Design an enzyme around this catalytic site. Structure first.
Site, mmCIF file in Angstrom:
data_model
loop_
_atom_site.group_PDB
_atom_site.id
_atom_site.type_symbol
_atom_site.label_atom_id
_atom_site.label_comp_id
_atom_site.label_asym_id
_atom_site.label_seq_id
_atom_site.Cartn_x
_atom_site.Cartn_y
_atom_site.Cartn_z
ATOM 1 N N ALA A 21 -0.473 11.089 14.014
ATOM 2 C CA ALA A 21 -0.641 12.072 12.933
ATOM 3 C C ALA A 21 -1.507 11.514 11.807
ATOM 4 O O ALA A 21 -2.412 12.202 11.339
ATOM 5 C CB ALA A 21 0.717 12.483 12.392
ATOM 6 N N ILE A 47 -5.378 -3.766 21.413
ATOM 7 C CA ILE A 47 -5.907 -5.062 20.960
ATOM 8 C C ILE A 47 -4.817 -6.127 20.991
ATOM 9 O O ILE A 47 -3.664 -5.830 20.683
ATOM 10 C CB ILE A 47 -6.593 -4.926 19.539
ATOM 11 C CG1 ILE A 47 -7.535 -3.688 19.428
ATOM 12 C CG2 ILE A 47 -7.313 -6.200 19.115
ATOM 13 C CD1 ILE A 47 -8.757 -3.624 20.455
ATOM 14 N N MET A 56 0.821 -1.192 0.000
ATOM 15 C CA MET A 56 0.000 0.000 0.000
ATOM 16 C C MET A 56 0.878 1.275 0.000
ATOM 17 O O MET A 56 0.357 2.382 0.101
ATOM 18 C CB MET A 56 -1.048 -0.053 1.116
ATOM 19 C CG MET A 56 -2.129 -1.108 0.881
ATOM 20 S SD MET A 56 -3.190 -0.806 -0.548
ATOM 21 C CE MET A 56 -4.174 -2.227 -0.509
ATOM 22 N N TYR A 105 2.283 7.931 13.736
ATOM 23 C CA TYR A 105 1.107 7.080 13.739
ATOM 24 C C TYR A 105 -0.154 7.888 14.127
ATOM 25 O O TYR A 105 -1.177 7.859 13.429
ATOM 26 C CB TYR A 105 1.351 5.922 14.714
ATOM 27 C CG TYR A 105 0.169 4.988 14.871
ATOM 28 C CD1 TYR A 105 -0.098 4.000 13.923
ATOM 29 C CD2 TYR A 105 -0.696 5.105 15.958
ATOM 30 C CE1 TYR A 105 -1.187 3.149 14.060
ATOM 31 C CE2 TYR A 105 -1.787 4.258 16.104
ATOM 32 C CZ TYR A 105 -2.023 3.273 15.157
ATOM 33 O OH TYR A 105 -3.072 2.408 15.334
HETATM 34 N N1 LIG Z 1 -3.659 -3.962 17.623
HETATM 35 C C1 LIG Z 1 -3.847 -2.867 18.354
HETATM 36 O O1 LIG Z 1 -3.567 -2.827 19.526
HETATM 37 C C2 LIG Z 1 -4.437 -1.645 17.689
HETATM 38 C C3 LIG Z 1 -4.849 -0.585 18.491
HETATM 39 C C4 LIG Z 1 -5.540 0.483 17.945
HETATM 40 C C5 LIG Z 1 -5.823 0.503 16.594
HETATM 41 N N2 LIG Z 1 -5.411 -0.499 15.794
HETATM 42 C C6 LIG Z 1 -5.711 -0.455 14.287
HETATM 43 O O2 LIG Z 1 -6.143 -1.723 13.879
HETATM 44 C C7 LIG Z 1 -5.752 -2.025 12.520
HETATM 45 C C8 LIG Z 1 -5.159 -3.409 12.458
HETATM 46 O O3 LIG Z 1 -4.021 -3.458 13.339
HETATM 47 P P1 LIG Z 1 -3.329 -4.819 13.808
HETATM 48 O O4 LIG Z 1 -2.739 -4.603 15.147
HETATM 49 O O5 LIG Z 1 -4.247 -5.961 13.605
HETATM 50 O O6 LIG Z 1 -2.110 -4.897 12.776
HETATM 51 P P2 LIG Z 1 -1.082 -6.051 12.368
HETATM 52 O O7 LIG Z 1 -1.249 -7.334 13.089
HETATM 53 O O8 LIG Z 1 0.357 -5.543 12.293
HETATM 54 O O9 LIG Z 1 -1.492 -6.171 10.828
HETATM 55 C C9 LIG Z 1 -1.287 -5.144 9.838
HETATM 56 C C10 LIG Z 1 -1.702 -5.715 8.507
HETATM 57 O O10 LIG Z 1 -1.341 -4.794 7.447
HETATM 58 C C11 LIG Z 1 -0.497 -5.442 6.518
HETATM 59 N N3 LIG Z 1 0.471 -4.475 6.012
HETATM 60 C C12 LIG Z 1 1.622 -4.060 6.632
HETATM 61 N N4 LIG Z 1 2.373 -3.277 5.897
HETATM 62 C C13 LIG Z 1 1.662 -3.157 4.713
HETATM 63 C C14 LIG Z 1 1.935 -2.479 3.505
HETATM 64 N N5 LIG Z 1 3.062 -1.794 3.273
HETATM 65 N N6 LIG Z 1 1.026 -2.584 2.509
HETATM 66 C C15 LIG Z 1 -0.066 -3.329 2.711
HETATM 67 N N7 LIG Z 1 -0.432 -4.002 3.804
HETATM 68 C C16 LIG Z 1 0.483 -3.882 4.774
HETATM 69 C C17 LIG Z 1 0.093 -6.644 7.258
HETATM 70 O O11 LIG Z 1 0.503 -7.723 6.395
HETATM 71 P P3 LIG Z 1 1.888 -7.744 5.600
HETATM 72 O O12 LIG Z 1 3.022 -7.471 6.597
HETATM 73 O O13 LIG Z 1 1.976 -9.196 5.178
HETATM 74 O O14 LIG Z 1 1.833 -6.803 4.496
HETATM 75 C C18 LIG Z 1 -1.065 -7.061 8.154
HETATM 76 O O15 LIG Z 1 -1.961 -7.932 7.473
HETATM 77 C C19 LIG Z 1 -4.833 -0.882 12.106
HETATM 78 O O16 LIG Z 1 -5.512 0.067 11.288
HETATM 79 C C20 LIG Z 1 -4.424 -0.302 13.455
HETATM 80 O O17 LIG Z 1 -4.198 1.091 13.339
HETATM 81 C C21 LIG Z 1 -4.703 -1.583 16.331
HETATM 82 C C1 LIG Z 2 -4.469 3.851 20.423
HETATM 83 C C2 LIG Z 2 -3.808 3.615 21.775
HETATM 84 C C3 LIG Z 2 -4.670 2.727 22.667
HETATM 85 O O1 LIG Z 2 -3.690 4.905 22.400
HETATM 86 C C4 LIG Z 2 -2.406 3.011 21.605
HETATM 87 C C5 LIG Z 2 -1.400 3.234 22.513
HETATM 88 C C6 LIG Z 2 -0.144 2.636 22.388
HETATM 89 C C7 LIG Z 2 0.110 1.773 21.380
HETATM 90 N N1 LIG Z 2 -0.874 1.521 20.442
HETATM 91 C C8 LIG Z 2 -0.865 0.777 19.291
HETATM 92 C C9 LIG Z 2 0.296 -0.041 18.828
HETATM 93 C C10 LIG Z 2 1.364 0.806 18.133
HETATM 94 C C11 LIG Z 2 1.050 2.059 17.609
HETATM 95 C C12 LIG Z 2 2.035 2.904 17.132
HETATM 96 C C13 LIG Z 2 3.347 2.490 17.164
HETATM 97 CL CL1 LIG Z 2 4.607 3.623 16.769
HETATM 98 C C14 LIG Z 2 3.686 1.229 17.605
HETATM 99 C C15 LIG Z 2 2.691 0.390 18.076
HETATM 100 C C16 LIG Z 2 0.687 -1.220 19.707
HETATM 101 C C17 LIG Z 2 0.075 -1.478 18.384
HETATM 102 N N2 LIG Z 2 -2.011 0.931 18.666
HETATM 103 N N3 LIG Z 2 -2.814 1.779 19.427
HETATM 104 C C18 LIG Z 2 -2.123 2.129 20.504
#
Ligand SMILES: NC(=O)c1ccc[n+]([C@@H]2O[C@H](COP(=O)([O-])OP(=O)(O)OC[C@H]3O[C@@H](n4cnc5c(N)ncnc54)[C@H](OP(=O)(O)O)[C@@H]3O)[C@@H](O)[C@H]2O)c1
Ligand SMILES: CC(C)(O)c1cccn2c(C3(c4ccc(Cl)cc4)CC3)nnc12
Ligand SMILES: NC(=O)c1ccc[n+]([C@@H]2O[C@H](COP(=O)([O-])OP(=O)(O)OC[C@H]3O[C@@H](n4cnc5c(N)ncnc54)[C@H](OP(=O)(O)O)[C@@H]3O)[C@@H](O)[C@H]2O)c1
Ligand SMILES: CC(C)(O)c1cccn2c(C3(c4ccc(Cl)cc4)CC3)nnc12
Ligand SMILES: CC(C)(O)c1cccn2c(C3(c4ccc(Cl)cc4)CC3)nnc12
Ligand SMILES: CC(C)(O)c1cccn2c(C3(c4ccc(Cl)cc4)CC3)nnc12
EC number: 1.1.1.146
Lengths: 265, 265
Positions: free
Chosen positions: A161, A194, A69, A159
């Protein structure tokens, strides 16, 4: 209105960042509901594995197109292809993010550009590419964000931002669709910490907060998007949507429309 | 505490987008206060004209370096040069924006990239380049934003995206400076509609709201930055800072720090 898994039976859904974490769980939930699904990530192997399990879980059809992407041509081509593979689009799930590690900001400008390109620009490229199809089906977009997209915390400036940028952009698009009487819904999903392996690995020894389960998270996103809600908050505290809700912004947003020339829409 | 024009006498200040609008007014106010000023914009001629009036108004010294904030190497070189020109930096005023016209978002990914590059990326490039100097003088950054950087309206999606992005980024930087005990202040200036020739020429026949005077606006920014306020709201309604203030965000921001390992800072 209450949610029914029947609402997603035979729907044509795109899920970005579907090879792991929340994306893979959404793929799985969508399959069990009997939807047509087209998945993307960079890992062709990972996508292959989730497409298999999707078919096994009960997916109407399951496709994948691997790629980065970081490439805006890929991002727009992907939508066109996916739309052709299903013969339409009912829901667009913009979920992928580029890799970021918790660090007090110093000088990584190239990281900041990569973050904005992948986390923000690609989402606007894909939504613009999917909109004609979604306009036809009276469809939906799910924009995956975080608490960091509504408030601020140390060590995540680039992030934060990008997530803030998504809110700014898609909230404008949502308002624009409503005033032009276009029945396409925009759901900004504000997620807390998460269970994902990548998230948990990233915060280890830095942050102490409890994480929510990825399976429940994925379902809450789907439910919220299907129900056409403007925002979905998914987090451990029930205070979060009241604290981050910002009704003041909502008041300003409504009242400000009185200054626009209605002929513009 | 209360503001004194004496607070800016002999201070070394950078003002971006200084050839017209609010930037030129800040240049003028800073000159009358007796500050050392380094101005930038693309128009070498326009910068020459404002440097002349600055010297005439009482500026301790007045310099200019013409160029485009589309170029990240220029943005970084500019700070280095300006810092050498004055032998230091006390205040960085990030004000320039790329041209945008009121339009319901259709497409124009290239415009969205330009908006993010100029309105957002250049500000992070310059703040990173100016921070060592500001760390020395216990200085300040003024990040110029809008109501569109705190709330949403139609026809300004890319612009709103960039202002939202600044809030996300610089609020993280502010918190980071505070927790690392670095005495550098960050002032996000949330502006309503201002009577610039450029602003009035864009909203003509589209938006009907009353605009505030540019001279008073420029002074309120300087005052707020000098007084080391986190946010300055400048707009016709006194309701705006109460409506857009978001104390809920502030509460969550404070409380969430309890989960960070204090050893990281
Ligand atoms: N997990 C949390 O704690 C958390 C908290 C708040 C919000 N979120 C939001 O939740 C969503 C999912 O997060 P997640 O924690 O499940 O992430 P994750 O486990 O790291 O997964 C990210 C996904 O994006 C893909 N990806 C990475 N680099 C890419 C690139 N250059 N082009 C296309 N695809 C790419 C990865 O697969 P590949 O590496 O194979 O490309 C993977 O399928 C995100 O929008 C994140 O901001 C997550
Ligand atoms: C949104 C929330 C709850 O404030 C939050 C706090 C701290 C970490 N969070 C993340 C991860 C992340 C994000 C950015 C970078 Cl640079 C690295 C790792 C762990 C996935 N996703 N959301 C959050
Ligand atoms: N005026 C309003 O109603 C309003 C409302 C809310 C917020 N604001 C904020 O206030 C600030 C000032 O706005 P304004 O209305 O005074 O703007 P303005 O009159 O259009 O001035 C913008 C300035 O930026 C410069 N600039 C433009 N493109 C540039 C580029 N590529 N590289 C470098 N400099 C560039 C311009 O000079 P050159 O063309 O010569 O380069 C000019 O000096 C902005 O941050 C804006 O977001 C304004
Ligand atoms: C912030 C606020 C008060 O909501 C607002 C509303 C409407 C116009 N505003 C502008 C201008 C502008 C911005 C973006 C584009 Cl694309 C074009 C012109 C007129 C200068 N600056 N702020 C505002
Ligand atoms: C139309 C425009 C320029 O986009 C706009 C955006 C945001 C605020 N605006 C306002 C004020 C206002 C309105 C309603 C309430 Cl409840 C409070 C304060 C500040 C006066 N007037 N116009 C605007
Ligand atoms: C530490 C981290 C991950 O960056 C973080 C950011 C934002 C919220 N966080 C929370 C909750 C909370 C905290 C305080 C109040 Cl007042 C309300 C709700 C949701 C539980 N727990 N950790 C975090």
């Amino acid at each position: 209105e209450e949610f029914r898994p029947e609402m997603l039976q035979g729907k044509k859904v795109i899920v970005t960042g579907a090879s792991k974490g929340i994306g893979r769980e959404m793929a799985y939930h969508l399959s069990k509901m009997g939807a047509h699904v087209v998945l993307t990530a960079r890992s062709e192997e990972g996508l292959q594995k989730v497409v298999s399990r999707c078919l096994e879980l009960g997916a109407a059809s399951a496709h994948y197109i691997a790629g980065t992407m970081e490439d805006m041509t890929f991002a727009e081509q992907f939508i066109v292809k996916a739309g052709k593979l299903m013969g339409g689009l009912d829901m667009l799930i913009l979920n992928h993010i580029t890799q970021t590690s918790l660090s007090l900001f110093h000088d990584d400008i190239h990281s900041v550009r990569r973050v904005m390109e992948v986390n923000f620009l690609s989402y606007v490229v894909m939504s613009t590419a999917a909109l004609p199809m979604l306009k036809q089906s009276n469809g939906s977009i799910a924009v995956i964000s975080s608490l960091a997209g509504k408030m601020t915390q140390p060590m995540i400036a680039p992030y934060s931002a990008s997530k803030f940028a998504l809110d700014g952009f898609f909230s404008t698009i949502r308002t624009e669709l409503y005033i032009t009487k276009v029945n396409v819904s925009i759901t900004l999903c504000v997620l807390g910490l998460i269970d994902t392996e990548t998230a948990m690995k990233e915060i280890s020894g830095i942050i102490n907060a409890q994480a929510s389960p990825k399976e429940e998270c994925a379902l809450e996103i789907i439910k919220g998007t299907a129900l056409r809600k403007s925002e979905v908050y998914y987090d451990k505290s029930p205070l979060t949507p009241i604290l981050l809700g910002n009704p003041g912004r909502k008041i300003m947003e409504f009242f400000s429309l009185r200054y626009y020339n209605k002929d513009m829409f």
